[PDB]
mmCIF file of C-alpha atoms in Angstrom:
data_model
loop_
_atom_site.group_PDB
_atom_site.id
_atom_site.type_symbol
_atom_site.label_atom_id
_atom_site.label_comp_id
_atom_site.label_asym_id
_atom_site.label_seq_id
_atom_site.Cartn_x
_atom_site.Cartn_y
_atom_site.Cartn_z
ATOM 1 C CA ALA O 3 -45.055 30.274 -10.105
ATOM 2 C CA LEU O 4 -42.059 30.182 -7.751
ATOM 3 C CA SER O 5 -40.532 33.536 -6.989
ATOM 4 C CA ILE O 6 -36.759 33.674 -6.620
ATOM 5 C CA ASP O 7 -37.032 34.345 -2.888
ATOM 6 C CA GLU O 8 -39.394 31.365 -2.549
ATOM 7 C CA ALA O 9 -37.047 29.086 -4.489
ATOM 8 C CA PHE O 10 -34.150 30.004 -2.228
ATOM 9 C CA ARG O 11 -36.208 29.548 0.957
ATOM 10 C CA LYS O 12 -37.150 26.096 -0.339
ATOM 11 C CA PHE O 13 -33.522 25.343 -1.237
ATOM 12 C CA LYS O 14 -32.530 26.482 2.272
ATOM 13 C CA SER O 15 -35.140 24.232 3.880
ATOM 14 C CA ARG O 16 -33.842 21.288 1.833
ATOM 15 C CA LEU O 17 -30.340 21.939 3.196
ATOM 16 C CA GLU O 18 -31.524 21.958 6.807
ATOM 17 C CA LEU O 19 -31.291 18.889 8.998
ATOM 18 C CA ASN O 20 -34.516 17.043 9.799
ATOM 19 C CA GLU O 21 -35.229 14.627 12.657
ATOM 20 C CA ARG O 22 -34.852 11.398 10.675
ATOM 21 C CA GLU O 23 -31.414 12.501 9.467
ATOM 22 C CA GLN O 24 -30.295 13.363 13.004
ATOM 23 C CA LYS O 25 -31.564 10.026 14.306
ATOM 24 C CA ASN O 26 -29.639 8.242 11.546
ATOM 25 C CA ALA O 27 -26.378 10.032 12.439
ATOM 26 C CA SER O 28 -26.813 9.010 16.111
ATOM 27 C CA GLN O 29 -27.585 5.414 15.093
ATOM 28 C CA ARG O 30 -24.526 5.206 12.807
ATOM 29 C CA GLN O 31 -22.425 6.674 15.641
ATOM 30 C CA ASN O 32 -23.691 4.042 18.102
ATOM 31 C CA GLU O 33 -23.057 1.262 15.547
ATOM 32 C CA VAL O 34 -19.448 2.207 14.790
ATOM 33 C CA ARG O 35 -18.769 2.979 18.466
ATOM 34 C CA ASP O 36 -20.203 -0.331 19.716
ATOM 35 C CA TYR O 37 -18.090 -2.187 17.156
ATOM 36 C CA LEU O 38 -14.896 -0.228 17.812
ATOM 37 C CA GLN O 39 -15.367 -0.622 21.592
ATOM 38 C CA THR O 40 -15.113 -4.412 21.189
ATOM 39 C CA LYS O 41 -11.693 -3.911 19.582
ATOM 40 C CA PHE O 42 -10.264 -0.824 21.321
ATOM 41 C CA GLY O 43 -10.427 0.767 24.723
ATOM 42 C CA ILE O 44 -12.740 3.655 23.828
ATOM 43 C CA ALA O 45 -14.020 5.857 26.629
ATOM 44 C CA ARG O 46 -16.673 7.734 24.602
ATOM 45 C CA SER O 47 -17.460 9.232 21.200
ATOM 46 C CA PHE O 48 -19.096 12.405 19.951
ATOM 47 C CA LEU O 49 -20.191 13.932 16.652
ATOM 48 C CA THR O 50 -18.132 16.925 15.629
ATOM 49 C CA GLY O 51 -16.963 18.866 12.588
ATOM 50 C CA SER O 52 -19.331 20.790 10.341
ATOM 51 C CA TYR O 53 -22.129 18.373 11.226
ATOM 52 C CA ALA O 54 -22.158 19.586 14.836
ATOM 53 C CA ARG O 55 -21.865 23.227 13.726
ATOM 54 C CA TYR O 56 -24.819 22.869 11.283
ATOM 55 C CA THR O 57 -22.610 23.888 8.362
ATOM 56 C CA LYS O 58 -22.594 20.493 6.650
ATOM 57 C CA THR O 59 -24.486 20.301 3.354
ATOM 58 C CA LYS O 60 -26.628 17.555 1.795
ATOM 59 C CA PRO O 61 -26.275 14.639 1.364
ATOM 60 C CA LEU O 62 -24.594 14.186 4.745
ATOM 61 C CA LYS O 63 -21.112 12.781 4.039
ATOM 62 C CA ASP O 64 -17.883 12.401 6.014
ATOM 63 C CA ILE O 65 -19.474 13.051 9.408
ATOM 64 C CA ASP O 66 -16.636 13.377 11.920
ATOM 65 C CA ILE O 67 -16.811 11.131 15.006
ATOM 66 C CA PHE O 68 -14.066 11.529 17.611
ATOM 67 C CA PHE O 69 -13.342 8.198 19.311
ATOM 68 C CA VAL O 70 -11.793 9.094 22.667
ATOM 69 C CA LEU O 71 -9.255 6.423 23.652
ATOM 70 C CA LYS O 72 -8.958 5.188 27.258
ATOM 71 C CA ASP O 73 -5.743 5.305 29.293
ATOM 72 C CA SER O 74 -5.138 1.623 28.497
ATOM 73 C CA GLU O 75 -4.624 2.737 24.879
ATOM 74 C CA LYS O 76 -2.098 5.497 25.671
ATOM 75 C CA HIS O 77 0.696 3.595 23.863
ATOM 76 C CA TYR O 78 -0.765 4.870 20.572
ATOM 77 C CA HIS O 79 0.021 8.438 21.649
ATOM 78 C CA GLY O 80 3.744 7.707 21.560
ATOM 79 C CA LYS O 81 3.665 5.736 18.334
ATOM 80 C CA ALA O 82 3.520 7.350 14.899
ATOM 81 C CA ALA O 83 0.260 8.499 13.314
ATOM 82 C CA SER O 84 -0.081 5.608 10.857
ATOM 83 C CA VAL O 85 -0.044 3.006 13.653
ATOM 84 C CA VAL O 86 -3.385 4.017 15.208
ATOM 85 C CA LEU O 87 -4.928 4.718 11.814
ATOM 86 C CA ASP O 88 -3.797 1.374 10.381
ATOM 87 C CA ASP O 89 -5.222 -0.481 13.388
ATOM 88 C CA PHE O 90 -8.531 1.394 13.117
ATOM 89 C CA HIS O 91 -8.587 0.768 9.366
ATOM 90 C CA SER O 92 -7.929 -2.939 9.921
ATOM 91 C CA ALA O 93 -10.703 -3.358 12.491
ATOM 92 C CA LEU O 94 -13.180 -1.468 10.308
ATOM 93 C CA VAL O 95 -12.379 -3.518 7.192
ATOM 94 C CA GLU O 96 -13.219 -6.713 9.127
ATOM 95 C CA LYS O 97 -16.796 -5.500 9.615
ATOM 96 C CA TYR O 98 -17.547 -3.248 6.635
ATOM 97 C CA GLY O 99 -15.217 -4.696 4.033
ATOM 98 C CA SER O 100 -12.349 -3.429 1.950
ATOM 99 C CA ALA O 101 -14.293 -1.292 -0.548
ATOM 100 C CA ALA O 102 -16.227 0.662 2.146
ATOM 101 C CA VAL O 103 -13.223 1.686 4.301
ATOM 102 C CA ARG O 104 -10.585 4.272 3.263
ATOM 103 C CA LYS O 105 -7.558 5.610 5.164
ATOM 104 C CA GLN O 106 -7.309 9.398 5.202
ATOM 105 C CA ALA O 107 -4.781 11.780 6.753
ATOM 106 C CA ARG O 108 -6.480 12.086 10.157
ATOM 107 C CA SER O 109 -9.281 9.514 10.057
ATOM 108 C CA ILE O 110 -10.737 6.393 8.489
ATOM 109 C CA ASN O 111 -13.771 6.994 6.285
ATOM 110 C CA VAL O 112 -16.492 4.347 6.551
ATOM 111 C CA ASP O 113 -18.973 4.382 3.674
ATOM 112 C CA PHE O 114 -22.333 2.772 4.478
ATOM 113 C CA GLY O 115 -23.150 2.283 0.766
ATOM 114 C CA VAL O 116 -26.518 4.034 0.885
ATOM 115 C CA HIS O 117 -28.304 4.789 -2.373
ATOM 116 C CA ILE O 118 -27.889 8.441 -3.452
ATOM 117 C CA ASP O 119 -30.346 9.488 -6.158
ATOM 118 C CA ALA O 120 -29.976 12.163 -8.834
ATOM 119 C CA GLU O 121 -31.452 14.858 -6.558
ATOM 120 C CA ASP O 122 -29.040 13.998 -3.689
ATOM 121 C CA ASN O 123 -31.739 12.246 -1.625
ATOM 122 C CA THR O 124 -30.812 9.216 0.482
ATOM 123 C CA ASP O 125 -34.102 8.571 2.337
ATOM 124 C CA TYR O 126 -32.688 10.623 5.237
ATOM 125 C CA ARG O 127 -29.641 8.383 5.724
ATOM 126 C CA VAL O 128 -26.073 9.558 6.304
ATOM 127 C CA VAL O 129 -23.664 8.482 3.542
ATOM 128 C CA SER O 130 -20.449 7.991 5.550
ATOM 129 C CA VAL O 131 -18.528 8.803 8.738
ATOM 130 C CA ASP O 132 -14.951 9.890 9.446
ATOM 131 C CA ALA O 133 -13.669 7.797 12.371
ATOM 132 C CA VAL O 134 -11.112 9.855 14.302
ATOM 133 C CA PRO O 135 -8.982 8.318 17.071
ATOM 134 C CA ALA O 136 -8.531 10.966 19.755
ATOM 135 C CA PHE O 137 -6.874 11.584 23.113
ATOM 136 C CA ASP O 138 -8.521 14.088 25.483
ATOM 137 C CA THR O 139 -5.454 16.006 26.714
ATOM 138 C CA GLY O 140 -7.468 18.176 29.117
ATOM 139 C CA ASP O 141 -8.612 21.389 27.469
ATOM 140 C CA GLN O 142 -8.366 20.037 23.906
ATOM 141 C CA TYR O 143 -7.756 16.835 21.946
ATOM 142 C CA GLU O 144 -4.942 15.278 20.000
ATOM 143 C CA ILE O 145 -5.554 13.308 16.811
ATOM 144 C CA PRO O 146 -3.204 11.449 14.427
ATOM 145 C CA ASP O 147 -1.906 13.237 11.334
ATOM 146 C CA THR O 148 -0.122 11.370 8.534
ATOM 147 C CA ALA O 149 1.195 14.541 6.891
ATOM 148 C CA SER O 150 3.154 15.159 10.112
ATOM 149 C CA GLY O 151 3.555 11.529 11.100
ATOM 150 C CA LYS O 152 2.665 12.582 14.645
ATOM 151 C CA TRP O 153 -0.237 13.643 16.856
ATOM 152 C CA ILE O 154 -1.626 17.184 16.497
ATOM 153 C CA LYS O 155 -3.789 19.375 18.717
ATOM 154 C CA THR O 156 -7.328 20.404 17.858
ATOM 155 C CA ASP O 157 -10.151 22.152 19.703
ATOM 156 C CA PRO O 158 -13.602 21.696 18.117
ATOM 157 C CA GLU O 159 -15.276 24.104 20.535
ATOM 158 C CA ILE O 160 -13.380 27.046 19.048
ATOM 159 C CA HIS O 161 -14.666 26.409 15.517
ATOM 160 C CA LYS O 162 -18.157 25.883 16.930
ATOM 161 C CA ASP O 163 -17.991 29.224 18.822
ATOM 162 C CA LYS O 164 -16.729 31.239 15.844
ATOM 163 C CA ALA O 165 -19.442 29.739 13.619
ATOM 164 C CA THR O 166 -22.212 30.702 16.021
ATOM 165 C CA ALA O 167 -20.751 34.206 16.452
ATOM 166 C CA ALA O 168 -20.631 34.704 12.666
ATOM 167 C CA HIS O 169 -24.181 33.341 12.363
ATOM 168 C CA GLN O 170 -25.556 35.678 15.037
ATOM 169 C CA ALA O 171 -23.804 38.612 13.348
ATOM 170 C CA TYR O 172 -25.495 37.796 10.006
ATOM 171 C CA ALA O 173 -29.094 37.721 11.286
ATOM 172 C CA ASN O 174 -28.863 33.901 11.547
ATOM 173 C CA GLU O 175 -28.405 33.505 7.759
ATOM 174 C CA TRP O 176 -24.649 32.779 7.727
ATOM 175 C CA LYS O 177 -24.676 29.007 8.153
ATOM 176 C CA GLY O 178 -27.279 28.557 5.433
ATOM 177 C CA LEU O 179 -25.246 30.565 2.929
ATOM 178 C CA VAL O 180 -22.247 28.377 3.770
ATOM 179 C CA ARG O 181 -24.263 25.174 3.143
ATOM 180 C CA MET O 182 -25.488 26.464 -0.240
ATOM 181 C CA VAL O 183 -21.997 27.335 -1.446
ATOM 182 C CA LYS O 184 -20.733 23.967 -0.180
ATOM 183 C CA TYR O 185 -23.556 22.343 -2.134
ATOM 184 C CA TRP O 186 -22.240 24.049 -5.291
ATOM 185 C CA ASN O 187 -18.732 22.990 -4.294
ATOM 186 C CA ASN O 188 -19.887 19.357 -4.326
ATOM 187 C CA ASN O 189 -21.643 19.550 -7.703
ATOM 188 C CA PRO O 190 -20.476 16.581 -9.833
ATOM 189 C CA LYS O 191 -20.534 18.962 -12.796
ATOM 190 C CA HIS O 192 -17.119 20.199 -11.648
ATOM 191 C CA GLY O 193 -15.746 16.682 -12.077
ATOM 192 C CA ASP O 194 -14.175 14.496 -9.436
ATOM 193 C CA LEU O 195 -12.100 17.276 -7.794
ATOM 194 C CA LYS O 196 -13.987 19.964 -5.902
ATOM 195 C CA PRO O 197 -13.370 23.644 -6.718
ATOM 196 C CA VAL O 198 -12.347 24.356 -3.102
ATOM 197 C CA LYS O 199 -10.380 21.917 -0.991
ATOM 198 C CA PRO O 200 -10.874 21.144 1.831
ATOM 199 C CA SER O 201 -14.594 21.881 2.184
ATOM 200 C CA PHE O 202 -13.879 23.436 5.610
ATOM 201 C CA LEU O 203 -12.016 26.252 3.815
ATOM 202 C CA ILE O 204 -15.348 27.575 2.531
ATOM 203 C CA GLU O 205 -16.454 27.957 6.150
ATOM 204 C CA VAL O 206 -13.132 29.478 7.258
ATOM 205 C CA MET O 207 -13.235 32.066 4.490
ATOM 206 C CA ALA O 208 -16.887 32.811 5.194
ATOM 207 C CA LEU O 209 -15.947 33.992 8.699
ATOM 208 C CA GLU O 210 -14.518 37.064 6.956
ATOM 209 C CA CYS O 211 -15.858 36.877 3.395
ATOM 210 C CA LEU O 212 -19.445 37.278 4.669
ATOM 211 C CA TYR O 213 -19.422 40.666 6.366
ATOM 212 C CA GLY O 214 -21.613 43.537 7.461
ATOM 213 C CA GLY O 215 -24.965 41.825 7.714
ATOM 214 C CA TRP O 216 -27.747 40.049 5.882
ATOM 215 C CA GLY O 217 -29.017 42.028 2.891
ATOM 216 C CA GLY O 218 -32.306 40.133 2.811
ATOM 217 C CA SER O 219 -32.119 38.706 -0.752
ATOM 218 C CA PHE O 220 -30.507 35.318 -1.331
ATOM 219 C CA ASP O 221 -29.674 35.844 -5.000
ATOM 220 C CA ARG O 222 -27.607 39.017 -4.523
ATOM 221 C CA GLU O 223 -25.994 37.551 -1.387
ATOM 222 C CA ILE O 224 -24.963 34.399 -3.245
ATOM 223 C CA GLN O 225 -23.635 36.425 -6.186
ATOM 224 C CA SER O 226 -21.519 38.706 -3.948
ATOM 225 C CA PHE O 227 -20.413 35.776 -1.785
ATOM 226 C CA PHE O 228 -19.036 33.995 -4.858
ATOM 227 C CA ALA O 229 -17.345 37.184 -6.108
ATOM 228 C CA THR O 230 -15.637 37.751 -2.738
ATOM 229 C CA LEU O 231 -14.569 34.118 -2.395
ATOM 230 C CA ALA O 232 -13.053 34.335 -5.889
ATOM 231 C CA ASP O 233 -11.140 37.484 -4.999
ATOM 232 C CA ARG O 234 -9.733 36.081 -1.740
ATOM 233 C CA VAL O 235 -9.114 32.339 -2.175
ATOM 234 C CA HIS O 236 -5.436 33.137 -2.768
ATOM 235 C CA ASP O 237 -5.060 34.878 0.629
ATOM 236 C CA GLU O 238 -3.696 32.975 3.592
ATOM 237 C CA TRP O 239 -6.426 31.426 5.741
ATOM 238 C CA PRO O 240 -4.865 30.388 9.048
ATOM 239 C CA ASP O 241 -6.487 27.933 11.372
ATOM 240 C CA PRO O 242 -9.028 30.047 13.318
ATOM 241 C CA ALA O 243 -8.146 27.936 16.386
ATOM 242 C CA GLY O 244 -4.458 28.818 16.063
ATOM 243 C CA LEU O 245 -3.485 25.185 16.676
ATOM 244 C CA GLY O 246 -2.533 23.952 13.198
ATOM 245 C CA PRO O 247 -1.271 24.940 9.753
ATOM 246 C CA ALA O 248 -3.228 27.269 7.520
ATOM 247 C CA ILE O 249 -6.418 25.842 6.009
ATOM 248 C CA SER O 250 -5.442 27.124 2.563
ATOM 249 C CA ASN O 251 -2.313 24.930 2.347
ATOM 250 C CA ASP O 252 -3.982 21.874 0.745
ATOM 251 C CA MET O 253 -4.265 23.326 -2.753
ATOM 252 C CA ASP O 254 -1.192 23.980 -4.889
ATOM 253 C CA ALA O 255 -1.014 27.130 -6.984
ATOM 254 C CA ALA O 256 -2.588 25.469 -10.032
ATOM 255 C CA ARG O 257 -5.480 24.093 -7.977
ATOM 256 C CA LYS O 258 -5.999 27.522 -6.368
ATOM 257 C CA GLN O 259 -6.114 29.039 -9.845
ATOM 258 C CA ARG O 260 -8.897 26.670 -10.922
ATOM 259 C CA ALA O 261 -10.675 27.529 -7.655
ATOM 260 C CA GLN O 262 -10.646 31.222 -8.414
ATOM 261 C CA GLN O 263 -11.903 30.657 -11.976
ATOM 262 C CA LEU O 264 -14.747 28.353 -10.902
ATOM 263 C CA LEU O 265 -15.736 30.718 -8.101
ATOM 264 C CA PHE O 266 -15.590 33.605 -10.600
ATOM 265 C CA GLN O 267 -17.684 31.637 -13.092
ATOM 266 C CA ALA O 268 -20.177 30.935 -10.308
ATOM 267 C CA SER O 269 -20.449 34.678 -9.723
ATOM 268 C CA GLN O 270 -21.034 35.274 -13.451
ATOM 269 C CA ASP O 271 -23.668 32.524 -13.660
ATOM 270 C CA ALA O 272 -25.309 34.033 -10.588
ATOM 271 C CA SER O 273 -25.210 37.494 -12.195
ATOM 272 C CA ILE O 274 -26.958 36.026 -15.237
ATOM 273 C CA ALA O 275 -29.713 34.568 -13.055
ATOM 274 C CA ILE O 276 -30.166 37.937 -11.329
ATOM 275 C CA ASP O 277 -30.460 39.769 -14.660
ATOM 276 C CA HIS O 278 -33.140 37.294 -15.776
ATOM 277 C CA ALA O 279 -35.126 37.917 -12.585
ATOM 278 C CA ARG O 280 -34.735 41.702 -12.851
ATOM 279 C CA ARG O 281 -36.182 41.605 -16.386
ATOM 280 C CA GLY O 282 -39.217 39.448 -15.541
ATOM 281 C CA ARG O 283 -37.743 36.214 -16.965
ATOM 282 C CA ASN O 284 -38.391 34.220 -13.793
ATOM 283 C CA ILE O 285 -38.436 30.718 -15.287
ATOM 284 C CA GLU O 286 -35.117 31.518 -16.967
ATOM 285 C CA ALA O 287 -33.677 32.748 -13.669
ATOM 286 C CA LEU O 288 -34.700 29.558 -11.837
ATOM 287 C CA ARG O 289 -33.161 27.467 -14.630
ATOM 288 C CA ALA O 290 -29.868 29.335 -14.330
ATOM 289 C CA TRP O 291 -29.774 28.806 -10.552
ATOM 290 C CA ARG O 292 -30.594 25.124 -11.137
ATOM 291 C CA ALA O 293 -27.655 24.809 -13.564
ATOM 292 C CA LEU O 294 -25.391 26.461 -10.992
ATOM 293 C CA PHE O 295 -26.392 24.532 -7.883
ATOM 294 C CA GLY O 296 -27.863 21.220 -9.028
ATOM 295 C CA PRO O 297 -31.141 19.336 -8.687
ATOM 296 C CA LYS O 298 -31.859 20.288 -5.067
ATOM 297 C CA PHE O 299 -32.494 23.866 -6.268
ATOM 298 C CA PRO O 300 -36.254 23.869 -6.973
ATOM 299 C CA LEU O 301 -37.934 24.789 -10.251
ATOM 300 C CA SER O 302 -41.379 24.723 -8.607
#
């Protein structure tokens, strides 16, 4: 039978990136870049966001791709945010169609319509990308923002550095704990609205909410991680880069209240699974973890 430690190691492995997935992200990048280069002056592109930090969970959705505009395109930098986004959205619709392409605040999501099965498998294919028009202003980048109407500054290296520092300070178990909790955050059992919004806020909070070091047991770590997240999701969570507004500003007070309850319920469910394990009821423990996380958590 599966021990609890073995089930979590297997769950962790399932949330790690394999070669075929990485190849598919590169290929999707080259596809969208080659198409957008025919319609915009685009100097280069790179994968960024949680995907590049290895804190993105499965299935791989909303992979951020910065599309660095050439000097010929500098007129967009003076125009409002919606101008560049609308033009990107319009070019992308022409190729991928209306249903697959959605304007967002700082990007255009392109959905490749891959089949996602009940256990979140996609035959190692990425589900979608976030296409982000960007100017390289020297040490950082500026990207459109429709909440502001204007261009905002962002520095992906800072988030990358803080993630690796947290990881190294948690015996290289930090990023995996983040991916597991994000997997729970994406469970369709919560409905159409995630408990925590945006997903990046889980990572931002984990920079402080995972502290001390790795205890060595996934089940107790997950339980305490949920309990701490519940206690602190009402705190202010500024941008760790110090370049934009706090990451905790997207949820209103009612949404934050649901977040705390769902995080608290996750801690209770996790406590129930721990009690089962402690009392020798191992199948029952696995089943409780499966109900918490979803089908990717193994029963065998």
